[PDB]
């Protein structure tokens, strides 16, 4: 029952890897303490291998089976469709890993006969064989962090032809089933603003609210064969075409439950018997399993009037308090249940009685004020990681631009507005790349977005108030300022000065560039501007943006109007 | 998670019920202490309701899931077929309870258009609907026992049309799957001789053998919705026609898992959420579930080199001993595991180091000696219940003749040979009914058998040795003797005297009756006869007798 077994072969890189922060002429304008930023590399994979390898034991009780029966009842109301081959390779990211069988993501997106012919053969094989383990590649991820150093996280994924097959059989299912099963508890159906609204309303609904986040140590590794088969039983509750049921059974037996691990050089590194981090079902499966085990644990701990919010392996619960001391006792019982269900904690959970002090999905609720002075709740987070990554992206082009995803998701924040928008629009202006579409990620899915569309995107997601927030909380201001001193980032006053320049430069360009200056940087001037609804914003097809999670799922979309 | 919920309406009888031993002119020749014998009736159904009604809790661990995965791997090798309507109709007992829809077992067996048409409507309904709970009738069983008084057992069964549908969908499965999944551990594949052989050889396979019987407290009531769904998942591993998969899913959802209980008067008595005692899957389901929970518990207890023998809810385990003090420790862990699995004990299990001292399926192994003096092991049991029922049957005609089933199954025993054969052949002779086919039950299935066929049947099942066993063990002799004194049954010496007379009478008739006198009572004369293989014996189609269990399954043969 070990999560993994290893042969000793090394997890190898695909090309040259850098760990030290690359430095160019723009670096010091953003961050000076270069030695604090680093990128993980395959050199530390062995340490991660150690950490994710352990034995799992599961003791399933009546609460567990009761919750599951409830979930299946809701799953039975779902009707899902099979995706055509063309539909599935249109969801493939342009730079997804090429197939070992002579074609790449470009060929897939182009519907080339070679890729399409191979895909149909992979599909036919899934239908005719439900036993043979499917090969997977294991890689160390290159991710940037700030010190105080963690080893690289690993990604396990099947070949390209198989990935397109997963979409055909399960795309509709993983996009629809989660919300039907868990209702308001499914986190990925919300925009950051909608998430804040749900948390605040829930908090307010309790007479004496108490809340806690639960961090499961290496969630993927805690996922057992039982768990993966339970997930498939939920998927099979849906009204599905016969071929889809066959494909789902086959993919569960041959891929989801486990399989061999091959490095980039083609050597066998070992075997996996836990969740694969790079399959279409990683997000949905984790959310379902996290919801199941947590719901059952709440019952076991006798938690009163619980409301949960789940995003994959991330969980936050808000309930009725039973007194501070009693709540502490309740959490130990909750944790004991989770442990029995194979979901032990990394950091032990602690009860919070202030909503703003709860961090879930790396974020927390905070308050500011709009133009009218009205209090407004919004989503924020510690900016350390977003700034560390921005520093890297300042001197290196990366496959995914975290700064852009951060501006989109954290547009209302003090730090995203004053530092990220200021710094990157300055670089884009200098290279005249305002209209150059860049790749970013939202809830794990990849989107190609032109920076010029930001004002419209922001208005649609957060409302015009994102362009006028002020009087942030002392707690938030202090966290931002502390982080800047730690990283050696210039203080907010410097950013304000620079923004005025960026704004004027954008305005001088006229057109959409002007709108960017007008809306994104109104916070920079003494005499603020009007700021009315942008006409073209309504035409942006934003449906699909906040429907489901797809981390490790190999999903792409292009922004279209 | 309660086994049952009740409305308060009474479980009612379907006719007059007798609790006191009926007495005729023949009674006293067999039993004098008439007050020791009684039959359970609906008057005690309330008490039974209290014993079987409780809340179930289950904690399923890795050992449980590991065993289950192994079981499904084996079940995946099974290929089962659907029975036609005619084949299923033929399996229906001639006196099975009639349908509430205007036809009975005679009509079913005859393939009458009315019965066949309704059967088809029930089948079609099972395919189209997999949600609506199916109605069931709850009755108090009338069973005879010797005192020192237990409450009536309850039987729950669906309508005749549904019963025939269960046959079409699962007869082949419940008949084949158990032995495939459990191998030598499936009890119903053996005749009593083969069961003794398996127990003996298993005992010998251990360097230091240790064994124990495990009695679960009202097993049927401990069976949960989980258990019943796990059973269906095993059935589904088989290679089945899609129509059979649908019918099985439907029967599981609508009947097996639970359903309303209706009394004989048509009033709702409550709801069942545990095993129904009167459905086709009762035997196979109980066997699968008992084996799953036990196999897993053996692992949890760290029992060494275990070999199990399962017959429904009856369990026996023989293993490699690790010392008395450790053996007792392991058993305690085994019981704790079973309890967690929702199978608490009625009587605390105890380790035995003497094979003959283990009682399983109400029986135990004993030893006698054949003509040559060779030691021979055979299956016996305390005869208190068989004799109590024989007394009842002496004065009352019953639907099932336990005396006949007991002669067939316990033919090698001291008590079945000297008392049962003597007493009943005497009565049959006097009424000239040796050739009258009587109904009896073997492993729950019903068989119509002519007493004149007994010599051949016995030879085929137990060998010629059954007609010559002697020098029974002191323990077995003493147990038989104590039982006779308790019930007021004439001592064995009297029975031997009577056998000489019954024997002479049979021989006087000539033909098959003479054969009965010759083979069945050779033990009664001082100058024993030849006893050679009976030619006609080979003709008997006994294939189907010891294949699977069918208790409560409404199954009939020849």
Swiss-Prot record, chain B:
Q: Which annotated residues bind Mg(2+) 2?
A: 215, 313-314
**Description of post-translational modifications:** The N-terminus is phosphorylated by host PRK2/PKN2.
| Mode of membrane association | Single-pass type IV membrane protein
The record gives the effect of mutating residue 282 to C as:
Almost complete loss of RdRp activity
Cofactor dependency: Mg(2+)
Catalytic reaction equation(s): RNA(n) + a ribonucleoside 5'-triphosphate = RNA(n+1) + diphosphate
Question: What modulates its activity?
Answer: Activity is up-regulated by PRK2/PKN2-mediated phosphorylation.
Instruction: Describe how the cofactor binds.
Output: Binds 2 magnesium ion that constitute a dinuclear catalytic metal center.
Swapping residue 282 to K leads to an effect described as:
Complete loss of RdRp activity
Q: Where in the cell is it found?
A: Host cytoplasm; Host endoplasmic reticulum membrane
Assembly notes: Homooligomer. Interacts with non-structural protein 5A. Interacts with host VAPB. Interacts with host PRK2/PKN2. Interacts with host HNRNPA1 and SEPT6; these interactions facilitate the viral replication. Part of the replication complex composed of NS2, NS3, NS4A, NS4B, NS5A and the RNA-directed RNA polymerase embedded in an ER-derived membranous web.
Its annotated function is as follows: RNA-dependent RNA polymerase that performs primer-template recognition and RNA synthesis during viral replication. Initiates RNA transcription/replication at a flavin adenine dinucleotide (FAD), resulting in a 5'- FAD cap on viral RNAs. In this way, recognition of viral 5' RNA by host pattern recognition receptors can be bypassed, thereby evading activation of antiviral pathways.
According to UniProt, the name of this protein is RNA-directed RNA polymerase
Q: Which organism is it from?
A: Hepatitis C virus genotype 1b (isolate BK) (HCV)
First and last residue shown, out of the full length, are 2422 to 2982 of 3010
